[PDB]
């Protein structure tokens, strides 16, 4: 996350932290039950194996709170491809169930019409991370967060040189040095309703980060709702 | 005056769906709909959607 600020105690509770070999975090992830993690599916490239950490926002200093948890099913769109990023989304379910507690909550997961309507309308959401804080830099120690601006559709396409799918929005600035990053990727993009946090995104990818006339690209979660309740069932 | 979930989301806290013509409330998993059929309240310590503060 390049800009915006520190997740503060609780203020990020679904965010999950993709974990490789060396235990080092490479993607984000949203919680969504006790058993299913949300990220993207280009995501699963990045480590041939790989667990889930969860109420982390410190990856230096190990505070007891965290938790890891082994993947015992991946479930990855298999429409996904690297040529045009489309459908970039999967669902990972756990071994085991993660124990909710401070910093550590699922994010609701709205029905489509609704979020369409409301959520998708609203002005702002809600990203977080540890991915890098510079388009060139490390990957963040702590977990970070920015409100980032829905942007148009027409502008979003006009202003990128690669294909804007149904399967896809833009978010963030114009100018205004805050973005999501890599290593961001995965993560989520949560829209606030009346204080409940609906997830309405993925961070998929951009061009480069919080670079000018360019967005933060996200996977729309409302255009896979019925994929993840059915992957949420074994399928 | 007539509208409905295009109006203040129905004054639902939730989901909101218009059947018949009139507003339907509805909530997200781990929460119940309130007996004034609007609120929607959570089932346990840790419901969907609610960041864990205290201070
Ligand atoms: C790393 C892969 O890069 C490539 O395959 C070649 O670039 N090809 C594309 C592309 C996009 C859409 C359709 C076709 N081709 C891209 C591209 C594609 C996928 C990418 C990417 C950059 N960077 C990442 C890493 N994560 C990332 C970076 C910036 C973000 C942001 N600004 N909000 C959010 C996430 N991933 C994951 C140049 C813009
Ligand atoms: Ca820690």
Same mark, same amino acid.
């Given at each position: 996350?390049?800009?915006?600020?520190?997740?503060?105690?609780?203020?990020?509770?679904?965010?999950?932290?993709? +974990?490789?070999?060396?235990?080092?975090?490479? @993607?984000?992830?949203?919680?969504?039950?006790?058993?299913?993690?949300?990220?993207?599916?280009?995501?699963?490239?990045?480590?041939?194996?790989?667990?889930?950490?969860?109420?982390?926002?410190? $990856?230096?200093?190990?505070?007891?709170?965290?938790?890891?948890?082994?993947?015992?099913?991946?479930?990855?769109?298999?429409?996904? $491809?690297?040529?045009?990023?489309?459908?970039? +989304?999967?669902?990972?379910?756990?071994?085991?169930?993660?124990?909710?507690?401070?910093?550590?909550?699922?994010? @609701?997961?709205?029905?489509?019409?609704?979020?369409?309507?409301?959520?998708?309308?609203?002005?702002?959401? +809600?990203?977080?991370?540890?991915?890098?804080?510079?388009?060139?830099?490390?990957? *963040?120690?702590?977990?970070?967060?920015?409100?980032?601006?829905?942007?148009?559709?027409?502008?979003?396409?006009?202003?990128?040189?690669?294909?804007?799918?149904?399967?896809?929005?833009?978010?963030?600035?114009?100018?205004?040095?805050?973005?999501?990053?890599?290593?961001?990727?995965?993560?989520?993009?949560?829209?606030?309703?009346?204080? $409940?946090?609906?997830?309405?995104?993925?961070?998929?990818?951009?061009?480069?980060?919080?670079?000018?006339?360019?967005?933060? +690209?996200? $996977?729309?979660?409302?255009?896979?709702?019925?994929?993840?309740?059915? *992957?949420?069932?074994?399928? | 005056?007539?509208?409905?979930?295009?109006?203040?989301?129905?004054? @639902?806290?939730?989901?909101?769906?218009?059947?018949?013509?009139?507003?339907?409330?509805?909530?997200?998993?781990?929460?119940?709909?309130?007996?004034? %059929?609007?609120?929607?309240?959570?089932? %346990?310590?840790?419901? @969907? %959607?609610?960041?864990?503060?205290?201070?």
């Amino acid at each position: 996350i390049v800009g915006g600020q520190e997740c503060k105690d609780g203020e990020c509770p679904w965010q999950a932290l993709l +974990i490789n070999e060396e235990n080092e975090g490479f @993607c984000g992830g949203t919680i969504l039950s006790e058993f299913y993690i949300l990220t993207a599916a280009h995501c699963l490239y990045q480590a041939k194996r790989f667990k889930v950490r969860v109420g982390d926002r410190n $990856t230096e200093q190990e505070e007891g709170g965290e938790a890891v948890h082994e993947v015992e099913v991946v479930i990855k769109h298999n429409r996904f $491809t690297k040529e045009t990023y489309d459908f970039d +989304i999967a669902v990972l379910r756990l071994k085991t169930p993660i124990t909710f507690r401070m910093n550590v909550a699922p994010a @609701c997961l709205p029905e489509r019409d609704w979020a369409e309507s409301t959520l998708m309308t609203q002005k702002t959401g +809600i990203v977080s991370g540890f991915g890098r804080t510079h388009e060139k830099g490390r990957q *963040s120690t702590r977990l970070k967060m920015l409100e980032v601006p829905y942007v148009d559709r027409n502008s979003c396409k006009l202003s990128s040189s690669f294909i804007i799918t149904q399967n896809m929005f833009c978010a963030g600035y114009d100018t205004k040095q805050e973005d999501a990053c890599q290593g961001d990727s995965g993560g989520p993009h949560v829209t606030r309703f009346k204080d $409940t946090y609906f997830v309405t995104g993925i961070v998929s990818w951009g061009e480069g980060c919080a670079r000018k006339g360019k967005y933060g +690209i996200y $996977t729309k979660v409302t255009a896979f709702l019925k994929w993840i309740d059915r *992957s949420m069932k074994t399928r | 005056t007539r509208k409905l979930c295009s109006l203040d989301n129905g004054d @639902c806290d939730q989901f909101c769906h218009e059947e018949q013509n009139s507003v339907v409330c509805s909530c997200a998993r781990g929460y119940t709909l309130a007996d004034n %059929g609007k609120a929607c309240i959570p089932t %346990g310590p840790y419901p @969907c %959607g609610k960041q864990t503060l205290e201070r």
